Amino acid sequence: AHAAIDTFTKYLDIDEDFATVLVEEGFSTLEELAYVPMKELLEIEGLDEPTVEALRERAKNALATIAQ
Numbered sequence: 551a552h553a554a555i556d557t558f559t560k561y562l563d564i565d566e567d568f569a570t571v572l573v574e575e576g577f578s579t580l581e582e583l584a585y586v587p588m589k590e591l592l593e594i595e596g597l598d599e600p601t602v603e604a605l606r607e608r609a610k611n612a613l614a615t616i617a618q
């Protein structure tokens with residue numbers, strides 16, 4: 551458990567356990583969480599649309615913040 555998990559945990563403001571699930575599901579960057587079609591994110595266990603939209607918003611805000 552390294553870089554990718556730490557990024558999701560810190561910038562998406564979620565628990566490490568779920569950040570770990572994201573990596574196991576094949577995700578590794580904020581760009582993916584923010585821009586990949588929702589239908590895809592909705593395929594991972596534990597996620598429903600409202601939460602996916604919240605995570606996408608956080609991913610977008612994180613990218614803007616990091617760019618600074």
Ligand SMILES: [Au+]
Nearest residue numbers: 595596597598
């Ligand atoms: Au669910």
